[PDB]
Design an enzyme around this catalytic site. Sequence first.
Site, PDB file in Angstrom:
ATOM      1  N   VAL A 197       0.851  -1.184   0.000  1.00 19.73           N
ATOM      2  CA  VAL A 197       0.000   0.000   0.000  1.00 19.73           C
ATOM      3  C   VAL A 197       0.886   1.233   0.000  1.00 19.73           C
ATOM      4  O   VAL A 197       0.386   2.304  -0.325  1.00 19.73           O
ATOM      5  CB  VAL A 197      -0.964   0.032   1.198  1.00 19.73           C
ATOM      6  N   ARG A 224       5.222   2.969   0.605  1.00 15.48           N
ATOM      7  CA  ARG A 224       6.644   2.833   0.860  1.00 15.48           C
ATOM      8  C   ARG A 224       7.130   4.202   1.323  1.00 15.48           C
ATOM      9  O   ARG A 224       6.395   5.180   1.402  1.00 15.48           O
ATOM     10  CB  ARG A 224       7.321   2.436  -0.458  1.00 15.48           C
ATOM     11  N   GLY A 225       8.419   4.224   1.564  1.00 14.28           N
ATOM     12  CA  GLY A 225       9.107   5.467   1.928  1.00 14.28           C
ATOM     13  C   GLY A 225      10.576   5.037   1.809  1.00 14.28           C
ATOM     14  O   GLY A 225      10.826   3.835   1.668  1.00 14.28           O
ATOM     15  N   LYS A 226      11.464   5.992   2.009  1.00 14.82           N
ATOM     16  CA  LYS A 226      12.869   5.682   1.988  1.00 14.82           C
ATOM     17  C   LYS A 226      13.311   4.575   2.934  1.00 14.82           C
ATOM     18  O   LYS A 226      14.373   4.014   2.637  1.00 14.82           O
ATOM     19  CB  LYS A 226      13.673   6.893   2.494  1.00 14.82           C
ATOM     20  N   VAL A 257       5.382  -0.769   3.151  1.00 11.75           N
ATOM     21  CA  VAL A 257       4.108  -0.863   3.826  1.00 11.75           C
ATOM     22  C   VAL A 257       3.089  -1.637   3.010  1.00 11.75           C
ATOM     23  O   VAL A 257       2.846  -1.448   1.842  1.00 11.75           O
ATOM     24  CB  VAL A 257       3.530   0.526   4.166  1.00 11.75           C
ATOM     25  N   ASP A 302       5.760  15.484  10.875  1.00  9.93           N
ATOM     26  CA  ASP A 302       5.579  15.017   9.506  1.00  9.93           C
ATOM     27  C   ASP A 302       4.116  15.075   9.110  1.00  9.93           C
ATOM     28  O   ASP A 302       3.641  14.204   8.366  1.00  9.93           O
ATOM     29  CB  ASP A 302       6.241  13.660   9.283  1.00  9.93           C
TER      30      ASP A 302
HETATM   31  N1  LIG Z   1      -4.813   1.732   2.890  1.00  8.13           N
HETATM   32  C1  LIG Z   1      -3.811   2.095   3.647  1.00  8.13           C
HETATM   33  N2  LIG Z   1      -2.696   2.569   3.164  1.00  8.13           N
HETATM   34  C2  LIG Z   1      -1.858   2.838   4.188  1.00  8.13           C
HETATM   35  C3  LIG Z   1      -2.064   2.676   5.537  1.00  8.13           C
HETATM   36  N3  LIG Z   1      -1.049   3.011   6.302  1.00  8.13           N
HETATM   37  C4  LIG Z   1      -0.203   3.421   5.438  1.00  8.13           C
HETATM   38  N4  LIG Z   1      -0.570   3.321   4.143  1.00  8.13           N
HETATM   39  C5  LIG Z   1       0.202   3.776   3.002  1.00  8.13           C
HETATM   40  O1  LIG Z   1       1.544   3.654   3.281  1.00  8.13           O
HETATM   41  C6  LIG Z   1       2.138   4.958   3.138  1.00  8.13           C
HETATM   42  C7  LIG Z   1       3.461   5.002   3.834  1.00  8.13           C
HETATM   43  O2  LIG Z   1       3.587   4.604   5.189  1.00  8.13           O
HETATM   44  P1  LIG Z   1       4.062   5.607   6.303  1.00  8.13           P
HETATM   45  O3  LIG Z   1       3.586   4.986   7.580  1.00  8.13           O
HETATM   46  O4  LIG Z   1       3.481   6.955   6.147  1.00  8.13           O
HETATM   47  O5  LIG Z   1       5.474   5.841   5.703  1.00  8.13           O
HETATM   48  P2  LIG Z   1       6.962   5.972   6.071  1.00  8.13           P
HETATM   49  O6  LIG Z   1       7.420   4.712   5.490  1.00  8.13           O
HETATM   50  O7  LIG Z   1       7.501   5.974   7.471  1.00  8.13           O
HETATM   51  N5  LIG Z   1       7.132   7.099   4.976  1.00  8.13           N
HETATM   52  P3  LIG Z   1       7.158   8.647   4.964  1.00  8.13           P
HETATM   53  O8  LIG Z   1       8.105   9.049   6.083  1.00  8.13           O
HETATM   54  O9  LIG Z   1       7.915   9.064   3.721  1.00  8.13           O
HETATM   55  O10 LIG Z   1       5.935   9.411   5.074  1.00  8.13           O
HETATM   56  C8  LIG Z   1       1.087   5.953   3.600  1.00  8.13           C
HETATM   57  O11 LIG Z   1       1.413   7.280   3.118  1.00  8.13           O
HETATM   58  C9  LIG Z   1      -0.141   5.296   2.941  1.00  8.13           C
HETATM   59  O12 LIG Z   1      -0.377   5.793   1.622  1.00  8.13           O
HETATM   60  C10 LIG Z   1      -3.276   2.175   5.934  1.00  8.13           C
HETATM   61  O13 LIG Z   1      -3.556   1.994   7.213  1.00  8.13           O
HETATM   62  N6  LIG Z   1      -4.157   1.880   4.970  1.00  8.13           N
HETATM   63 MG   LIG Z   2       7.502   8.225   7.918  1.00  4.05          MG
HETATM   64 MG   LIG Z   3       4.541   8.449   5.799  1.00  5.30          MG
END
Ligand SMILES: Nc1nc2c(ncn2[C@@H]2O[C@H](COP(=O)(O)OP(=O)(O)NP(=O)(O)O)[C@@H](O)[C@H]2O)c(=O)[nH]1
Ligand SMILES: [Mg+2]
Ligand SMILES: [Mg+2]
Length: 327
Positions: A39, A41-43, A47, A150
């Site tokens: 669903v 990703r990030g650096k 996810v 963030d």
């Molecule tokens: N459907 C769905 N998508 C999700 C959920 N949680 C996360 N995602 C997707 O996964 C993305 C990235 O996860 P996140 O927890 O924000 O990212 P991070 O990996 O630490 N990345 P960043 O720091 O760049 O924001 C979210 O922006 C979202 O689009 C969720 O509970 N449901």
């Molecule tokens: Mg993050």
């Molecule tokens: Mg994020």
Amino acid sequence: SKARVYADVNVLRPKEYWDYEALTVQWGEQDDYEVVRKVGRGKYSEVFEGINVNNNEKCIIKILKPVKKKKIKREIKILQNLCGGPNIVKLLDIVRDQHSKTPSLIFEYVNNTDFKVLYPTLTDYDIRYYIYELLKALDYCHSQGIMHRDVKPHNVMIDHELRKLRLIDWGLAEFYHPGKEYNVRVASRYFKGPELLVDLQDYDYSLDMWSLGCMFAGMIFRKEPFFYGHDNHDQLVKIAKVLGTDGLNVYLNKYRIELDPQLEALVGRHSRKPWLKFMNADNQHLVSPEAIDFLDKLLRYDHQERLTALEAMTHPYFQQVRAAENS
Ligand SMILES: Nc1nc2c(ncn2[C@@H]2O[C@H](COP(=O)(O)OP(=O)(O)NP(=O)(O)O)[C@@H](O)[C@H]2O)c(=O)[nH]1
Ligand SMILES: [Mg+2]
Ligand SMILES: [Mg+2]
């Protein structure tokens, strides 16, 4: 600079509360959660929508990439401190793959609608409602001594049908300590506050309020991201051509910051552009006086003048949302 609210939460709570490096992970069972579909990703993460094999409930599996374990224990400590908080993503379990010790964070699952497709469908009221719900999360994390760092649309999951919102991604979040200089390399460029862009390191919870204002501007003006610079210096120039450079020079002067000379040249001198100049006929039905008055009190260079999350929830802009909550 010091926060105007919740400045002593860490100061006065027991050291174990904020001493995340002394955290001891009670690892769960990696086999309880199976990946179903990617669903995000990030650096430093991958996810996935997952499934809890024991009870068949959806979950989120956040597989981390190799990073200093200080970064993994902070985020876990923060999620444990906030669990149960209004609209705060729930951390359910923490697992490791035996062979590589790759940690995965397990969270509740939100059936999200991508913000680039969901936001443009939001009625005026929905915007009011979702920002209000996001404000609950922010007042609650701030009151527990933590800055998110963030705030942005990718980090706000919304199940529109259930009208449920969760503030996710606590990976940049931090404990607020009065006086501490923090790295300004936080938040996404478009949501970075002036303090991050002009190197004021002793920032506080109000950095999240600028980021929220950026999201709000984008939603009411239908312009994502509202402040679109290609790099930090340019992110500041974009801010300065909207807020004006007179306000900026009062701010810099107040905190005693001289701009990097070339940044300074780049910024130039710009008149303040009133908020209604971004009004156009697509956003018309969303840009009323209360919306502008609210926005105007979030996007201030001076982080000290921005509304607190607690104050923003009581702004008249959200009156109808509050009345609905009272039933
Ligand atoms: N459907 C769905 N998508 C999700 C959920 N949680 C996360 N995602 C997707 O996964 C993305 C990235 O996860 P996140 O927890 O924000 O990212 P991070 O990996 O630490 N990345 P960043 O720091 O760049 O924001 C979210 O922006 C979202 O689009 C969720 O509970 N449901
Ligand atoms: Mg993050
Ligand atoms: Mg994020």
